[PDB]
Amino acid sequence: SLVNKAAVDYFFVELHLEAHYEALRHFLLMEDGEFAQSLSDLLFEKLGAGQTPGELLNPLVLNSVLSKALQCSLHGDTPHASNLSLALKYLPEVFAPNAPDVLSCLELRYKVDWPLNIVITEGCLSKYSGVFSFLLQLKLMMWALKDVCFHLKRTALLSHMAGSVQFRQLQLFKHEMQHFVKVIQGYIANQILHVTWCEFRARLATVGDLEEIQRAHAEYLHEAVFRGLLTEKAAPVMNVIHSIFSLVLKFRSQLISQAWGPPGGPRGAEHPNFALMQQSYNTFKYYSHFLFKVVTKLVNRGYQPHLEDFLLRINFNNYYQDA
Amino acid sequence: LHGLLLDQHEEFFIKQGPSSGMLAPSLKQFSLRVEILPSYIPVRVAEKILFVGESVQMFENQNVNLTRKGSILKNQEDTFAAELHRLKQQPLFSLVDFEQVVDRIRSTVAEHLWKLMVEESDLLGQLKIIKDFYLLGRGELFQAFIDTAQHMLKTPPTAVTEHDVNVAFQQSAHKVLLDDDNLLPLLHLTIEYHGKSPREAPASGWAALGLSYKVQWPLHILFTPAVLEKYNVVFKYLLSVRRVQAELQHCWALQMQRKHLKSNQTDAIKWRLRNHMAFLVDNLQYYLQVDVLESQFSQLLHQINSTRDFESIRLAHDHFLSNLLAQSFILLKPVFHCLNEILDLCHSFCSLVSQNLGPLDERGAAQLSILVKGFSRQSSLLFKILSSVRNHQINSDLAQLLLRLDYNKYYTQAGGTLGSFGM
Amino acid sequence: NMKDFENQITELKKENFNLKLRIYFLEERMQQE
Amino acid sequence: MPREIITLQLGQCGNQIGFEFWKQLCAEHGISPEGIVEEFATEGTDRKDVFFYQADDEHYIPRAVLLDLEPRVIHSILNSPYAKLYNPENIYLSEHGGGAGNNWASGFSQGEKIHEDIFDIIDREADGSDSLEGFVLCHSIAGGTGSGLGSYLLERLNDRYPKKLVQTYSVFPNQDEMSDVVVQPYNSLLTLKRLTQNADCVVVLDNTALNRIATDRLHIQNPSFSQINQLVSTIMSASTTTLRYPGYMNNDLIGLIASLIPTPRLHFLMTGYTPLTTDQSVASVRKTTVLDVMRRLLQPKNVMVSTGRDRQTNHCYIAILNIIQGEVDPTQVHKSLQRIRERKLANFIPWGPASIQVALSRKSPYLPSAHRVSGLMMANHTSISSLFERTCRQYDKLRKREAFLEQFRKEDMFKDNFDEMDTSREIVQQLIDEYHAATRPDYISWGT
Amino acid sequence: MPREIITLQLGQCGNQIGFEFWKQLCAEHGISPEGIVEEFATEGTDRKDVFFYQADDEHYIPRAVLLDLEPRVIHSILNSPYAKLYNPENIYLSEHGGGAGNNWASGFSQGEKIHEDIFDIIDREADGSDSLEGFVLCHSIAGGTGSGLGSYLLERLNDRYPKKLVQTYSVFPNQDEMSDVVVQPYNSLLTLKRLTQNADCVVVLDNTALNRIATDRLHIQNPSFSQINQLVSTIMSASTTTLRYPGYMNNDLIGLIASLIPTPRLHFLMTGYTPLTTDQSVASVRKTTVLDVMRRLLQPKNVMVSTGRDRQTNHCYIAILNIIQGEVDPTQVHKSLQRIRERKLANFIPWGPASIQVALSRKSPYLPSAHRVSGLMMANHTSISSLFERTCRQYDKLRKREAFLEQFRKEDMFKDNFDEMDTSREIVQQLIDEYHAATRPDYISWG
């Protein structure tokens, strides 16, 4: 007991485990919201322009993006943000269009010194890097769709295309997809990023030994993965979510590929990809209804009780139940 | 002292029993070897020793999971060891002194266990939860739940329907303003019946629906599987009673909804039969609640508050449960079956009355006549049974029910049969 | 990772340069003796 | 969710009765007259959602609609501390304040003028009710405003909630008091008509019996019409406490009325209460036993219906349910059931099972009970036919005599003839005969 | 990086709203009335650059361009606590001091006279903005100065940033309160016209709802234009805290509004806040749960839109997003969704997926929050059309009645008729009809 107490005190005061968790929150958890926004916008600009990993993930380009995001972040200049490093898992030849996993090659690594690397294991840092990569990919897809939306908005403003039936339908589909994505993101943030983080803090406050600290960190990461839908039980669900994000990105790409035309007729302005955007919207709606039905069947099957929370987040206003 | 059966060669008069059990190996891990029990060890004394050893094993098993809370006797364990050493120094084995020491240790342990169970382990809270849910203690809440979920639970249960039923129960609780998120997790829906495995059932999914309650340690010792099964039986029974009450209320609502419709003789007869069935069911349910359920619960609470022995509390709870089971006639298999048949006839009558606002159609008239004959025969049988039980003084509650049914002597004048609804 | 790789590369370059300087002065001394 | 009941307050007298009922309900639930729960209202065992709606996150407002053809009672409610109890969208007050002139038809026409507003109010209250069971109309049947407005309210409840029960509180005229409402028998006829056609259950409140109870039990030498209406509201509250204060029994209106309504038309209930104590006599806690209570309940003086001595009908109880509130000893309950059966305090129908039912319920912790043990009996008793036959005979006598009908002839319901009063009298006579039949084995066909 | 917003303050109400907003922002960031960070304001975690510019390392100046046709509002700002917060070169006050005479056209003409100065101020504020998205003009549509100057400011923002989005918070006249600006419906119509032509999204703020909330919830019997503007500024601050205090969610205005604006034409937004508390009731930090919050949100006293009782159209929410800031338990959020569903507290569009998005935002560390959890809701609700339809009906009634037109007749735009106001009312009516249509499945084919 004396050894355990002294070890807890050493880990807290000397190894700054709480400070390490704070650094992970500041840098790896994108607590600097401005840095995350700038990173997402730059990432979606590079991905939508089709830059290759050798062009986009070039150390000069990555370092410039990081410097700009940190300079725009209120927390980007903090010493906790300095522990963040952007590394490449692999170099893609081409950025796949509308791929939700396009930015999964990016990894945020956290360095743990001795003895903290016994508790903050390379496996823990790898799981954190995977979570960071997934959040970065999702932010890239959301940013790409936002950039497509802004392009359509600017084209409508320049061309008075507010009356376009095709443009209005595409905009409504984009808005509904963005609402769904933001609800899902809020759910994931609350469960994995907020609830699991609070659980980790309570557990980090309760860690008694280095093996107990390692167990607490592994539990934190497991809760983050499970609430993050990264578990094998959620692998079919995570794959379906990734497919939905890919379809949303494809719709975004179809909308953004061309600016709105001038309003030429009573139907308003026509988009050259208007038929493709409408087809993408119809496919998104069909896939959303199928996802809702699958999640309902799984919840009623008891296999994935957290998917009941996921279904609630998807169908919070019962919009998908009535459709 | 340690709940440890240190018998590798079976030399002691105690034999390790099969532990029924971090479900810690059930105190039946050790058992009395009656074949090996010394004739100088009295059977009563052997039972006392068994209780002491079981208590020690339970205490060790709990301290395995419980933080290092010391023995109930703490440092007095060594004092009893010194007393045992003096007994070893006694030239003659006295069962009296050994039994006295064992009883002192048992009493100390039982008082500390009772204190831990009631204050530290809140046995009363768990019993209240079980009463409210398993015993339908929240009768208004469970009534509202039945009223809301009836459309889901009238159909055969499914393996997924259990989730839907638990969701409907939570929704009704919120509607009944039962916003206890801790109780709903204690409530567990049950098991697919009759097509919605849904393969096996006797009656229909509505009868197969049950509630399970997760008993926490150490109270799982109190809520034994047989206790949980009795609670589930009580839940099923209360749900059936509430369903029949709701059916009678729906027949009343249909009559009231049809009050602008001219009451025909068939519709008046249907409504009258529904009213008689509702009166009888209400009086039976009031009898079960107050004279059986409330009486037994009051007795249990008074005994629990009057005793400082955890074993005394367990005995009181078992007595309460036994009295409930006896007064509910559940043990009286033929009486229970007759009551179930009467309830099914009453439900069919209530459905017929609720469906027909106006005079009964030919199908409605046939259903009304069949229900009237069934109800009159079953109620005559029930009245005869109740009068027989009163005459035999077997069950006070049955005599109270018989008195309540023939209070205005209508059933006595009607021969104990609920009057035939004239179709 | 990346910042740690940067630090390792920078340290290794500094150590190699310091060793090269020490070698250079050692060779000049051995050429003077 | 609780089975919510909408309270309809009709006309001047009915609106006064409703206001006093809402005051009593607030006191029983510990609700302030402003709709705020009193600190004393710690007994969360009552079903407020049955009778009250939440006006805000903190204020519970009674689901009561105050409708009058005379401004005095409605304005007094709206000028009382209880102004916030009623839904303001459910409050219709006649601008003219003239009332119905003791004419049922005028009250009915006033209800018809506010028919759209009244049914909008009813629908709003139903949407404000989580599990609205139906409508309960509180009114007097003897006046002009309360009777006609009561008939209108019953009609609108039937129109808006045709599958929901519609209960009415129909005050039969006092036979010992001179009613100032000369058209009361006509008013009674219109109310009985609406109870037969548009209400699902009619609780007959004979003002003669209310006055008798006030004199003998409440020690009120001259019960005022306001005092009679407040007594009726108190009696209704006590009888409905098990619905409003949920317990083991009578947790829903349909379950409560199921035992009471032998036929859909035969929905005229009589009430009884025991032990009866005067508000002033709270000082002496009389050790009234349940057996003594049951013995007193069989006395016509304790029945909330003043039945004439009908010599033609072998009056009997069709059904009896005793809801007892307060401290009750089970041995006393057993002695009470024994005494009721042994004393034949209720004679039952031969056509179905009937007894004196006893339900035990806790009392409201917020309402001080003047009696250590109290109980309300609601009963269908063939002696109510003598009350129902008397109401029918008075209706026919008024319609045939056009007494006080000139005030009603201004309103369309009575402008050309009183045929609706005569048909109502005939329906009430058939109800009386059925109640006499309900004492007979032919009760299976009673009300056909 | 944050999406910076340039604030244009027009007329008495707009200037009052700006002054109260700057006071609230200063208090939340620990900024002195002079724009200097207070010594206690050590939490450098707030994003001042979205709405404020730094005049020095210590002095924060609002990225605000002040344009008014009446000198009264400028004098009230200079007498406000925020008088030293704003750069004096970014404040444009009409030299004539005569105001607009409650005439939108006069205010617009004065804005046109100060167009160069106003757009220079807006550009100066944008340069103080690290990532200026565009300009947001805060004004009232009911007065003369705030309406005309607001339209002028919107026009100049559209001229300078034609490829950038321009959202406006346009306060529509109170329909339940008697406006002292008898020409208020014409002014409101002109402001709605400018929002339709030069803004990309107009969030309709019905002054009737502000007055109703002040009466029923804040217990303010007669909300002043300054008091209504200060309530609007407080609501805007609470809704913008996630933009000003960056966190995991809602770090930009566009992220918040994306879920709210389904189509470019269906850009009339309604706002919601929960829990709603009166300014006097700050004392008791109620442990409000998400279920309790959601229940309070359904109370009209907390809705920032005064929808008329339409009996013919079942106006409904297409989607609702609540951004909640503070200590929030996810289990409480789950219970809130459950209670809302059981109570049917939110109706969504039936033709597509819609949900309640949840954004978590940090509170200002320098400002003690009386609420453990606070939240802004952005929702698309067909009842928001009722505010726009009511504004249009009032405009049409005034133009058809020529009411208060003599004050408008002084300005050339309104000298002969109010036909521009009536056409604006018709456009706002079409917007209302589209917003009601957006509750329906056929919104997919709108336009």
Curated annotation (Swiss-Prot), chain B:
GO terms for biological process: cytoplasmic microtubule organization; meiotic cell cycle; microtubule nucleation; mitotic cell cycle; protein-containing complex assembly; spindle assembly. Its main location: cytoplasm. GO terms for cellular component: centrosome; cytosol; gamma-tubulin complex; gamma-tubulin ring complex; membrane; microtubule; microtubule cytoskeleton; recycling endosome. It comes from the Eukaryota. One of its GO terms (molecular function) is structural constituent of cytoskeleton. It is found in: Cytoplasm, Cytoskeleton, Microtubule organizing center, Centrosome. Keywords: Cytoplasm, Cytoskeleton, Intellectual disability, Microtubule, Primary microcephaly. Ubiquitously expressed. Component of the gamma-tubulin ring complex (gTuRC) which mediates microtubule nucleation. The gTuRC regulates the minus-end nucleation of alpha-beta tubulin heterodimers that grow into microtubule protafilaments, a critical step in centrosome duplication and spindle formation. It is linked to Microcephaly and chorioretinopathy, autosomal recessive, 3: A disorder characterized by congenital microcephaly and chorioretinal dysplasia associated with poor vision and nystagmus. Variable ocular anomalies include microphthalmia, retinal folding, retinal detachment, optic nerve hypoplasia, absence of retinal vessels, round areas of chorioretinal atrophy, and attenuated electroretinogram. Most patients have mild developmental delay and mild learning difficulties. This is Gamma-tubulin complex component 4. It comes from Homo sapiens. The chain holds residues 192 to 667 of 667 of the full protein.
Swiss-Prot record, chain E:
One of its GO terms (biological process) is mitotic sister chromatid segregation. The modification Phosphoserine is found at S131. Keywords: Cytoplasm, Cytoskeleton, Disease variant, GTP-binding, Lissencephaly, Microtubule, Nucleotide-binding, Phosphoprotein. InterPro entries: Gamma_tubulin (IPR002454), Tub_FtsZ_C (IPR008280), Tubulin (IPR000217), Tubulin/FtsZ-like_C (IPR037103), Tubulin/FtsZ_2-layer-sand-dom (IPR018316), Tubulin/FtsZ_GTPase_sf (IPR036525), Tubulin_C (IPR023123), Tubulin_CS (IPR017975). One of its GO terms (cellular component) is neuron projection. It holds the Pfam family Tubulin_C. The keyword Cytoplasm applies. Its main location: cytoplasm. Phosphorylation at Ser-131 by BRSK1 regulates centrosome duplication, possibly by mediating relocation of gamma-tubulin and its associated proteins from the cytoplasm to the centrosome. Signal peptide: none annotated. GTP binds at A142, G143, G144, T145, G146, S147, G148. GO terms for molecular function: GTP binding; identical protein binding; microtubule nucleator activity; structural constituent of cytoskeleton. It is found in: Cytoplasm, Cytoskeleton, Microtubule organizing center, Centrosome; Cytoplasm, Cytoskeleton, Spindle. It is linked to Cortical dysplasia, complex, with other brain malformations 4: A disorder of aberrant neuronal migration and disturbed axonal guidance. Clinical features include early-onset seizures, microcephaly, spastic tetraplegia, and various malformations of cortical development, such as agyria, posterior or frontal pachygyria, thick cortex, and subcortical band heterotopia and thin corpus callosum in some patients. Tubulin is the major constituent of microtubules, protein filaments consisting of alpha- and beta-tubulin heterodimers. Gamma-tubulin is a key component of the gamma-tubulin ring complex (gTuRC) which mediates microtubule nucleation. The gTuRC regulates the minus-end nucleation of alpha-beta tubulin heterodimers that grow into microtubule protafilaments, a critical step in centrosome duplication and spindle formation. Belongs to the tubulin family. Component of the gamma-tubulin ring complex (gTuRC) consisting of TUBGCP2, TUBGCP3, TUBGCP4, TUBGCP5 and TUBGCP6 and gamma-tubulin TUBG1 or TUBG2. TUBGCP2, TUBGCP3, TUBGCP4, TUBGCP5 and TUBGCP6 assemble in a 5:5:2:1:1 stoichiometry; each is associated with a gamma-tubulin, thereby arranging 14 gamma-tubulins in a helical manner. Gamma-tubulin at the first position is blocked by TUBGCP3 at the last position, allowing 13 protafilaments to grow into a microtubule. This is Tubulin gamma-1 chain. It comes from Homo sapiens (Human). The gene is TUBG1.
